[PDB]
Design a protein around this ligand. Sequence first.
Ligand SMILES: [Cl-]
Ligand SMILES: [Cl-]
Ligand SMILES: [Cl-]
Length: 130
Amino acid sequence: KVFERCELARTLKRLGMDGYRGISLANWMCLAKWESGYNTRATNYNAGDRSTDYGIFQINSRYWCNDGKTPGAVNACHLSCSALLQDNIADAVACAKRVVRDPQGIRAWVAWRNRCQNRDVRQYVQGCGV
Ligand SMILES: [Cl-]
Ligand SMILES: [Cl-]
Ligand SMILES: [Cl-]
C-alpha cells in the first residue's frame, strides 16, 4: 500500500516511533518519504553487492532481514524480508527500531543524511494530529 502522509504519521505514532532513540516522528516521516514514497511493497535490487532493499523504509537484506539470496548476509531483525512488504507495517517498524539501536542510529540510511539531516523537516507532520 501507498500511505497518505498524515495516515502514516499517526500509524507510526501508534507504533511508538515518536522519539524512539531520540528520533522525532518527522525524521521517520522524512525517511519513509525519500526511501519509498510511503510505499510498503517497494523492492530495489542493488546489483553492486547483490542485496535488496525492502518496503517502506527500504531495509537492506545484507544486515537486517533474510531473503536467502544475499551472499554473506545476516538477519538482525530476525524476519523474512517478505515481512517488510506487508501493508501492515508493524514488523517494518520493529526492524527500523532494531536498525537504530546500533551506533549510527538513523544515519544508517544514506537517504536520511542526504534529504533529512540538518534540514527543517516540520512539514512532514504538519496538520496530522501527531
Ligand atoms: Cl531533529
Ligand atoms: Cl517473517
Ligand atoms: Cl498486510
